[PDB]
Design a protein around this ligand. Sequence first.
Ligand SMILES: OC[C@H]1O[C@@H](NC(=S)N/N=C/c2ccc(Cl)cc2)[C@H](O)[C@@H](O)[C@@H]1O
Ligand SMILES: OC[C@H]1O[C@@H](NC(=S)N/N=C/c2ccc(Cl)cc2)[C@H](O)[C@@H](O)[C@@H]1O
Ligand SMILES: OC[C@H]1O[C@@H](NC(=S)N/N=C/c2ccc(Cl)cc2)[C@H](O)[C@@H](O)[C@@H]1O
Ligand SMILES: OC[C@H]1O[C@@H](NC(=S)N/N=C/c2ccc(Cl)cc2)[C@H](O)[C@@H](O)[C@@H]1O
Lengths: 810, 810
Amino acid sequence: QISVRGLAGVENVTELKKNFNRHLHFTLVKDRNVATPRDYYFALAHTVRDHLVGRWIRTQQHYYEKDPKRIYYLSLEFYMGRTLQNTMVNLALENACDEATYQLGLDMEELEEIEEDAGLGNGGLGRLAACFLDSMATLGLAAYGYGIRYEFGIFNQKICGGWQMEEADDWLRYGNPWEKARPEFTLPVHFYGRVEHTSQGAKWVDTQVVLAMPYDTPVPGYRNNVVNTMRLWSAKAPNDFNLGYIQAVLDRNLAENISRVLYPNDNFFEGKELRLKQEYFVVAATLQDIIRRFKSSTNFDAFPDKVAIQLNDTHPSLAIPELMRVLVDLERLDWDKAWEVTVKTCAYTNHTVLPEALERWPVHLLETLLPRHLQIIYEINQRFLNRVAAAFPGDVDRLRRMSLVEEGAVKRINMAHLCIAGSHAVNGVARIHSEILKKTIFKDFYELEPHKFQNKTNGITPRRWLVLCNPGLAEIIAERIGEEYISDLDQLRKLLSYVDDEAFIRDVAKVKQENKLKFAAYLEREYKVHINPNSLFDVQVKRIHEYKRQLLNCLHVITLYNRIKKEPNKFVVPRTVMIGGKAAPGYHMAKMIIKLITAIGDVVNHDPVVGDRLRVIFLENYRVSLAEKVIPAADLSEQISTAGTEASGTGNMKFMLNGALTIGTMDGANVEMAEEAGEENFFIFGMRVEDVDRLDQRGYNAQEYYDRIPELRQIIEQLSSGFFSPKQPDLFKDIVNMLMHHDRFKVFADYEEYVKCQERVSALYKNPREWTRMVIRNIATSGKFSSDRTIAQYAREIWGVEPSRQRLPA
Amino acid sequence: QISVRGLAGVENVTELKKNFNRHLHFTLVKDRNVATPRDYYFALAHTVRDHLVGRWIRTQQHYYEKDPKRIYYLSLEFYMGRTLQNTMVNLALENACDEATYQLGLDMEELEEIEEDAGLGNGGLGRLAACFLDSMATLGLAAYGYGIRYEFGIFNQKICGGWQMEEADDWLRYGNPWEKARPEFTLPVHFYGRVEHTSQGAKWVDTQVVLAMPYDTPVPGYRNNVVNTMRLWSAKAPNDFNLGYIQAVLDRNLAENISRVLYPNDNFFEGKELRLKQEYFVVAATLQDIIRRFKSSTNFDAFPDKVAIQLNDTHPSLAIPELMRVLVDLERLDWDKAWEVTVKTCAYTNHTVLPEALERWPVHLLETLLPRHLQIIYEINQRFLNRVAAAFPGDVDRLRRMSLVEEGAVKRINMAHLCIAGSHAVNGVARIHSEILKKTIFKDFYELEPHKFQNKTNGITPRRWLVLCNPGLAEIIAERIGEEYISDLDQLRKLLSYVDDEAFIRDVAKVKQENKLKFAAYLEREYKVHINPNSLFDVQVKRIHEYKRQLLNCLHVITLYNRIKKEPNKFVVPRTVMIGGKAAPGYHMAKMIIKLITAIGDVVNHDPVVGDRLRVIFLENYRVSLAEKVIPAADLSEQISTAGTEASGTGNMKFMLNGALTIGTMDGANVEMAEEAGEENFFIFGMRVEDVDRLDQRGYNAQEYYDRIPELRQIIEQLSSGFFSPKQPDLFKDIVNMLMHHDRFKVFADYEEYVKCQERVSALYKNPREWTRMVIRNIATSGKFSSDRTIAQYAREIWGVEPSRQRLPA
Ligand SMILES: OC[C@H]1O[C@@H](NC(=S)N/N=C/c2ccc(Cl)cc2)[C@H](O)[C@@H](O)[C@@H]1O
Ligand SMILES: OC[C@H]1O[C@@H](NC(=S)N/N=C/c2ccc(Cl)cc2)[C@H](O)[C@@H](O)[C@@H]1O
Ligand SMILES: OC[C@H]1O[C@@H](NC(=S)N/N=C/c2ccc(Cl)cc2)[C@H](O)[C@@H](O)[C@@H]1O
Ligand SMILES: OC[C@H]1O[C@@H](NC(=S)N/N=C/c2ccc(Cl)cc2)[C@H](O)[C@@H](O)[C@@H]1O
């Protein structure tokens, strides 16, 4: 149908059809008489995956032959989503498969909905890893993603009586066609035990052993015939484990629990032993794999020339002492040489400045679980602090501030300090975030080693986040400027010369309308909820956190409702306000926020005076597959975190690429987005980081705002009195109390400017032509936020490798 | 190479080769450069399994169209062994695959050794189910095997310091190419809860739900294009199970533990809750499947016309009250009609008379786990006992003897009594066993309902147990009488006319010699143990039990050793005595017996005076795959259970078919074997059942034998004094004490006759021509012991269906 989806040749369509029938028969053991839609999906998945194998084998053979420097991206999260469409897009098979299935009497889009998301992540950090893998393959880098194959990913969110309920994400139930188990590359991982000191160095003994079994998943580059590997480890008990008899076999579950479930607590670091085990498990297994591949090329001087390890946050920080352990204890290198190798090999990416999210592991945990690693960490600390003492003589408080060991009630290890000490590069994920790192939380480290600190502004892959999810927009762009922009997003700048083009303006607006209609239909079919597709689609989708200020959005919604109720016969621009996202199961306040949103909806959506002028919908089970649907349908992107709290954001970039305007604070990547598009083409409001700091010095008093803003007072009165919860009058007392007395994120302080700015949004939306022209200016300047740019910067500035857009032979 | 292994056509060999390469590439994601022998096995397995799919789909479609009476064989055990060679044999693909792999530069026999046994059984009962499935497919019956997919089968046995060690049989580690998961046919199974009585009958409520997910495995008939299904259930937690958050997900293991491991305790009934859960799980899931298939044909009068359920022992006895529950509570049939249907549907096979093996479930267990079933069982009992009271008025002790409920310290349900009451047919597994059932343990039931009691003498499949494991013997037989005997084993009688044939005598003896050399080589390669291939191969392989009297064999071995030591320069027929088998992990005495055997070996095998005249080897990890190796190599089969204790035996039949002579008691099927071959061609010894009974009435005094047999006294003195355990003098005190004071199985009573009979064996072996002639007479009369005969008898006499040797179209 559309050009960017590839050719549907006679030979290819015929071959796809026969291989589809072959798989249905030989692979699924079905015939068309009893086959379900799910059987058809799997037949298609097997048909498509066949096209990956040759490229996958020869890419990996190519790396073995050419022996380039290898990039190892270590993460506890890879938020991949669905794989079928992405594979088709990257192999130019989409139209061919669409045709082939059509001729078989099947709707491919229907088959695509059957695939489970690989939800092996929580939000931004996990999704970033996924975009990064796509870009590394597209840029021809010898890159490997290493993580854990969780049996259960991020929970499925159900909403019951307005409350979030969690259920297990049993994503492997029907089997995963995109993985290949590699039980032959199974590796032992050690836990517990004790350290023996001998004549010939330290020895870690009496350990318990858990096996790490790898599963390989392909990562196809965009039409370059490159297929990289994401290798995920699964925990397996050894066969003599616990070996009355029956119990010993049943107890195998204990060892295998390591890879059972993804921790969903993105709000609050929990020092849970199982989480620590997960972190070491991925690190220990991965490093053996790295070293094996390096030896299959004695001399570890060349190790940093052939290996880069990127630590995605501090979660895999144990790579640093583990590498030291292997180099010193097993390979018998001297400390100083091992340390030089380690530092040159490792680099660390920070993803937050919120103190409660920082990993600070109790010493007693590390003492029991990883006794040798604790000793190594102590030695790292001593030698590091001796360097600090020499650079800043007599500065005793600096020494305690910079220590990897935190003294207190329980002694803790600061994993962020460990990462900085043992990495040659430390980066933040947006310019303002990287600056905040140097100025505040890691200031001491920056002063000691300024050369270590870099910025790498986040990006998103334009394959998933434009071509895949918004083919209509991709096509109207390709009609004017060609297809090259898909792997060179800066080319979107050429669209600036079409800002006055009447045909293009009409097409951009039409694509959005089509997307909105498609999404309005989805909501009715799958959730039986009805919306007005002519209203402004006002969306805030992201994990529920106080810092992200879904509550500020709630306050605006209630403001609009109250203004309508006051002047019912006055015209207002119709809005559909959509808020979605999961709360960490133990995050009470975030769970209360979800309940608030639904409670507002219950009042607003059933008020006859309101009509279809205002609708508030909670988007259930927000996940990658839902993002791919809602983002193309959005008109307004809510990016309203308190300045200095959102390290980057990536959702923001997805909305910008897909033709929504942004209302946001000058926080994270919003700053750079406004800079690229021009501040005139952005709806900026609220305190800057400097204003937040000023307010903190003075002391934040929420009562002041309550006293001076009558509309805000009304809302707080309504919440308190039980207007939004008639049968449980005091339901939202926790929310009110927090807002009034202990709001870390200054919701009230940005309220007036927010509401004012929202009025300017409604004003522009009344003028469809000018709304769309500003949209074109956003899309046209979204190029910088391609993860291809981000990865090219990591490659050149951190990893010391050059990207390549060159095809491998097919 | 050999004719019975099929044609190796040019077209087939070429096609097998290309499909092998296709699977290696697309399925295994490897190329020849990095492929391991295991990769090659899997490529071959996938290549062969492709040939099953068409036949499998059309067999099952055929049953749906023709709607024959369906046979459901319910067992907690299916001891399948390896599947690759069996599939090739039944599809006539063996020579073609041999050629195809040869041309690829691979040894197929080497690839075959890589396959794990499906060890989903303990011994005879489990293996019988497997032979039965093969015969039902070969005889064209619409048959389904239903059981549990254990994650861990029978433990792998390691011998360490002479002691049995158990390790987990992780048979699914590399994946199972012979199964197809069917998550679409997943069914709920209920546990716990309580019974509510309403106006409209009883209701079972507040249950916990465990999901049953089926996995289908093909059962190919012998060259008839029939492929039946063995459906095995796996336990899955529902997604809202236990749904702080992390624990709830981890607790899913509790529900899924149901299908985790096979109970190995074949010696002693353990009333463990997990085992009860397993038994109900298979029954509940299976019956829903049966009823679904029956409805997809309101009127349950026709149920017994379209359904037969065979209960393999009492393990699935809960099928009786479960069927009643469904018919009465869910379908709303009256009790009397439901009961008529149930009785006509169910049949029960008994496999033992040993009281400690009989399932007697504590009422308190059933009360908690299955409250509705207990109520149904009580009602069954009341109505049954009313029938007994009417037939035998005033006989009050009969009433308590026949009750399904046993009174005592803890009230128990006798599952065997439940099975007899609710089945239209009850059978033993050999003529003497079935007679013992009518005369002793079920005498009361026989008097009430004599028509219910039948015999179905056990059999073995001549496909696995001749063609597959002994191709050399199969071929020399086919050379004279054709190939028809393979599915009509009675044709082996034609070999009687070759008993004086000099060419045939020479060939039979040559095949045995070749088998012995092959096995002597296997022992050196895989276990580094050396044997004399010219010695008599004296083998006893079977689970270790006191009733099977491995101890009596031990006494003979020591007798031979002592006789050699007394007269060293006297000629004795050389023997390699091989004993193998697993002991249930909690069976102390059986574990002591294994240690005794190894301890004897340690003394005998290192005595220079003995030389190579006597060797004692413990065969480690006896299992189906090992049986296939050792049985063709055997000269003498030890079948020496105390008369009246071995219900049938099937190992005995395997040895008879493969050219070994039998030394045995008149127990189980040995009686019928001797009857078929002629007592002159069998080495029969020891007490008959009647002699055992006489001895019991008098009182068994082992001291009498010790006092009157000097050679026996010497052995007991040696055991006591520490001759076989120099550093632990009292090691075997338990064994001696048992033999002397509490031997239920009268080892001493058969000692003299046993030793005497063994002398006659050695005498015959000195005359190779006469040894072989007697062998021919055994093989020639082994026809009755084909499971084809057994299954045809079940079909006609119990199930009411006619077998068919007719091909389905290819
Ligand atoms: O889904 C059922 C099972 O499939 C298996 N896959 C096998 S046998 N081949 N895959 C080949 C392959 C080819 C191409 C690609 Cl792009 C990925 C895998 C998986 O190893 C196993 O984990 C899974 O449960
Ligand atoms: O850089 C990518 C994105 O990273 C995010 N960080 C996230 S998702 N941390 N999760 C941490 C976490 C901690 C513990 C657990 Cl158990 C789970 C998740 C930033 O908030 C966002 O601004 C940025 O764009
Ligand atoms: O081995 C990896 C996985 O394979 C899967 N098999 C699939 S996708 N097709 N099988 C088709 C098939 C065809 C013929 C026959 Cl005779 C048996 C199965 C199994 O369902 C799964 O349990 C297992 O782990
Ligand atoms: O008829 C086939 C064979 O059946 C055998 N019975 C067996 S293996 N019972 N296992 C029982 C059992 C009980 C509990 C558990 Cl957890 C495991 C096994 C007979 O002993 C044998 O004579 C006969 O030939």
